[PDB]
Design a protein around this nucleic acid. Structure first.
Ligand SMILES: C[S@@+](CC[C@H](N)C(=O)[O-])C[C@H]1O[C@@H](n2cnc3c(N)ncnc32)[C@H](O)[C@@H]1O
Ligand SMILES: C[S@@+](CC[C@H](N)C(=O)[O-])C[C@H]1O[C@@H](n2cnc3c(N)ncnc32)[C@H](O)[C@@H]1O
Ligand SMILES: [Cu+2]
Ligand SMILES: [Cu+2]
Lengths: 85, 97, 97, 95
RNA sequence: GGACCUACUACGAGCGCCAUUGCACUCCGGCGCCACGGGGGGUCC
RNA sequence: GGACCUACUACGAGCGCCAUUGCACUCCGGCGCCACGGGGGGUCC
């Protein structure tokens, strides 16, 4: 149950800056977001981390937006293995 | 109200968002329902918060209205209707895109 | 008519039991907001009718927008705003339960 | 991943009774054609999930096509084609 | 088998809490409470 | 400083292909094509 949530199976064809703002459009409803980091690197291409201020927010986001088709690709959300700053 | 058009009219959108972000962010959510032709956005920030999403088939518009209704988009739940008939083009020609 | 918080649904599948129908309607209309009651007409002359009563008018409007003509039990339901004060007058006269 | 006769639904509202869910799904998916069975298990492994078995794949295709992401009991369902065939389907074909 | 009872028992049903996003078609996650129902026990017809 | 050009250079921005389902919080997978932009290089008013 980390604050940060780990999203993968994202549409890799989307630019990093566009993707960041597109994710904020959906996850802003759940609470205060601090940052959304997206690497378009080979190691972390279809992936993103969304950091919520409260754990209630991250839980509600994982609860609700699981399997949501994002750019026609359904997102796979997990709790992050490690805690964020 | 309206009849099943292939275009849907979205309003009650967050006016604080730039036009470029909104067009692209709407595509992120509504692309799942089918092929999108255009995404038109009210060009007046004073009275913005409106948008048109033009689908190829009416099936896409219908399914989109059912599912994404009341969806919190930028923490504001959007209000989706069927667009009036051939009205998506009227505002495009008249310059509100 | 005028935007009521209650919506009047008719053209319902008559073969369906009252208990199943109420619960199946709740399955679809819960997304639009909080539902107070779901009234179903147990009359033979005035059969195939139902009332879904919402807390907020915003909920009923989105429901009419989206679920209009929705094939429910293979029969497309036809939604209108309830005529003002009809639901209660129906709940009193027992025609709806 | 390929047009199966059954569709696999998950992200269902777990609080709903098995028979209510079975009947509520039939209320929605009967429009697409004749349904053979709707399998529902409220067990830890298979809860929040359902299988809808159609006679024709055309019905199943239209069902995934139309009702995808549809909020059912305020929870939007996520529809897939089933991986395997259903046992009732298998006998028709024999496998 | 009816009617009032009970220093007993959560078995059904019914509420909530936690956990689970899981591809099945040989039951079956874990708690807390419990209207009505069972099981035991007692007093009459 | 304007106008047309380059046996040159993919530095941006923009397209596609193959491969990858990967848990981060300094950084970088491989090709092919390139509108419009820069860098270098010329002929002119
Ligand atoms: S009843 C009695 C019925 C009567 N004994 C009979 O056989 O017809 C018992 C009541 O006590 C409650 N009860 C059941 N099990 C219980 C337990 N383990 N502890 C406390 N109360 C219980 C139930 O709610 C039920 O209404
Ligand atoms: S003006 C320069 C033009 O040369 C083209 N260009 C830039 N680099 C190039 C290269 N390495 N090889 C061939 N053409 C190039 C650009 O498309 C630009 O429009
Ligand atoms: Cu007893
Ligand atoms: Cu140059």
């Amino acid at each position: 149950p980390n604050h940060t949530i780990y999203i993968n199976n994202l549409n890799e064809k989307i630019k990093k800056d566009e993707l960041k703002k597109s994710l904020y459009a959906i996850f802003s409803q759940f609470g205060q977001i601090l940052d959304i980091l997206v690497s378009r690197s080979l190691k972390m291409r279809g992936q993103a981390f969304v950091i919520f201020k409260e754990v209630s927010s991250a839980t509600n986001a994982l609860r609700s937006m699981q399997g949501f088709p994002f750019y026609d690709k359904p997102m796979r959300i997990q709790y992050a293995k490690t805690d964020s700053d």
